[PDB]
Amino acid sequence: VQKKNPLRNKQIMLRLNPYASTFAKEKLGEVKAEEGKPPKVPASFKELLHEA
Amino acid sequence: RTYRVGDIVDIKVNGAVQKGMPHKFYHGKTGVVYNVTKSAVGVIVYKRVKHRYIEKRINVRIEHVKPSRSREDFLRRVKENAELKKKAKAEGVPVQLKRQPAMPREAHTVSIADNKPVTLAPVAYE
Amino acid sequence: RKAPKSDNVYLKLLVKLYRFLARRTEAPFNKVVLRRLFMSRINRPPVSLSRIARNLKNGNEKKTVVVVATVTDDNRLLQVPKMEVAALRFTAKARARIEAAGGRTLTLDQLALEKPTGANTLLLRGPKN
Amino acid sequence: IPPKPRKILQLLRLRQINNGVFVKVTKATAEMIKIVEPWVAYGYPNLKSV
RNA sequence: GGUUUUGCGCGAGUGUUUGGGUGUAAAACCCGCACGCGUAAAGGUGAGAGCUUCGGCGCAUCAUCGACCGAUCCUGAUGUAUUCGGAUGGAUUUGAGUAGGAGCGUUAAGCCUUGGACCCGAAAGAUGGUGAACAACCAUCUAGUAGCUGGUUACCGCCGAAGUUUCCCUCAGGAUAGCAGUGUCGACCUUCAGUUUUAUGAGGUAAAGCGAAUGAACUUUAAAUAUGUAAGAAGCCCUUGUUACUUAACUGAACGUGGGCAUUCGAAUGUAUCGACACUAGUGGGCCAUUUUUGGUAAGCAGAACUGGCGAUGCGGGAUGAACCGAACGCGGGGUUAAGGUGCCGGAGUGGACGCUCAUCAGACUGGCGCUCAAGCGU
Predict the structure, then answer these.
(1) N or C: which end of chain D has fewer CB within 10 A?
(2) Helices H, strands E: what count in chain D?
(3) Which three-class secondary structure state does DSSP give residue C114?
(4) How far is A1 from chain B (nearest CA, A)?
(5) What residues contact residue C51 under an 8 Å CB cut-off, 6+ apart?
(6) How many Cα neighbours within 13 Å face the side chain of C44?
(7) What family is this (chain B) (predicted)?
(8) Do residues B10 and B66 lie in contact, with contact meaning Cβ atoms separated by under 8 Å?
């Protein structure tokens, strides 16, 4: 009788998607990147960028 | 050239002989033969008007009419479809039969080695 | 459709009965009978005894003939076979000739009670124009 | 609207203004939407939009 | 008086009401002989609703192959009164023919013809009378008739146009098809499509190259731009006989062959569906704009096809209109925009960045007031 927005109503989202509770609980939307020292940009790429 | 009754025939209309020439709306068209004479040939050709189609029966003689090369794709397609379906049934493997509409390209890498990019400007001054 | 054009109240009774049947059974026979009950008189031409006698030939002599129209007598037919016919109306000579041959005469409600789904029936239409 | 682009827009289920459809990017469909470019706006959706 | 459709009764029959009988008396009830109209004087195969004991049986209708008849074309039997007849085998035969009847009567609605004929509206003409004094008037036929005007009476809902193709002949026009609608039949997202894609048609048209040849007409390649045709089951391929056809000849065509493909059954996307048959109202203007093409003029302009609109359209903008831009309409509340705007009239910025312009009637993506490091112009 009345369409309820799952993005506004959390119970409707839990009805359609049972994973929403543990998606919010385990913070899979704030996942961090892989750890370790990132390498530096190659000089060739930099000399190609600032060409004539 | 010899023409049957019921073959798909396309017309191109040259200016060599002006006898029995059709209008420029029929220039370079395609139709189906229902009538063959000593010289002329009766062809049905479809015609657009507003919202609908009217068939028109027109007479062109031999030097502008020729058998069309639109249908041979149908016969070659049915022949290959039958033959690779026979090979698929013999070998017991699924194979692709339809025509695909050419999906967009996938991902790949291009090497900068031996292919150093050149820098250009709107005008080619040299 | 939504209503029959006939003003016969018993025709509307048959229409209600076969609406219920068509709704509550998966029998195409009831739907065809309801469709022909909705139809007009010119679209329901009379079926003669000779046309039924022709169609009752191979293995249909034990089947019940169903005609959504009026069965008329045919003078050309000299011998009337034994026949169980269910129709809207029977002319007096047609009914008398059917019952004199040992056959039987039915209305559509007796058919709907004896054969609710149309098992072993022979649906016959009269000639068009 | 000319009859041929209107036929394209009826084939794409776009018969009203501000109407959205998902189309698989296919060269046939690509040519259709390049035909009706003067009436539509189209692009690549992300996961949030879908 | 015809004709179409809905209802009803009876049905190969149907219709009592000219009339007779009867009556509680113009009612109702009954019907003897006629008469009108109609009827009389079952084949195979393939689809096909429906049924099924799952083996099949198959309505109506359609296609195809056959059968019979009025009559027509030869061959011309036994026979014949001796000048009559048509038996057998053949024809590209027809028909408002047969092949298991559908009509009669009535009611309601629509249309057509004729009567005053949807209402009102000439000059006339004829018949019979009344007067005068150098044709006129009166009554009737007559509600005459022809064109052409004016008018043509409650509401709401649903669906909704055309101003064109072709033909014939009067000029003073109709018919056919188209647009709108109704019924029946057949399938049913099978199928269909103002569409893309694939192959294909006329443009190799532009371009690039000719350190390839050759010379826009050069081309390896190849645009742009529009428009026809085909995309399996109503299908494919090949092999073999027949034919009335055809050619030197299965050279092809048609009728008989066979096979396997229903789990990509042979692109995309849409599919609130399409085809046929039958029946029924209103309409035959032109104008503007675009694309392509031809010709002329001092310049405008003239001739073709094309779609979109107007006629039959309200709303927001557009200085009124109109064109043009947006967007197409049940009654309301809220939110957001399009085109256009935010100095005031007028709802919303005297918003921001960069420059230019002082015009003795600047300029305004000005209407008025008015504006000048704008309230002008370009981003």
Answers:
(1) C
(2) 2, 0
(3) helix
(4) 42
(5) C74, C124, C126, C127
(6) 22
(7) Belongs to the eukaryotic ribosomal protein eL21 family.
(8) yes
Q: Which nucleotide is nearest to C72 (CA to C1')?
A: E11
Take residue C50 and report the two structure tokens written for it. 């000779």
Closest C-alpha among A52, A48, A50 to residue B115: A48
Q: CA C49, CA C70: separation in Å to the nearest integer?
A: 11
CA of A18 to C1' of E147 (A): 88
Contact by Cβ (8 Å): B33, B3? yes
Element (H, E) at C34: helix C28-38
Distance from CA of D2 to the nearest CA of B (A): 13
For residue B123, count other CB atoms closer than 10 A to its CB.
6
Signed CA dihedral, C32, C34, C37, C43: sign only: negative
- Write the Ramachandran bin of B109: left for phi over 0, alpha for psi from -120 to 50, otherwise beta: beta
Cα C81 to Cα C101: distance, rounded to the nearest angstrom: 6
Rounded Cα gap, residues C39 and C21, in angstroms: 18
In degrees rounded to 5, what are phi and psi of residue D34? -70, -25
Do residues B43 and B65 lie in contact, with contact meaning Cβ atoms separated by under 8 Å?
yes
Pairing of strands B30-36, B40-49: antiparallel
Q: How far apart are the first and last CA of chain A?
A: 66
The helix/strand/coil state of C121 is strand
Q: Breaks in chain C follow which residues, C to N over 2.5 Å?
A: none
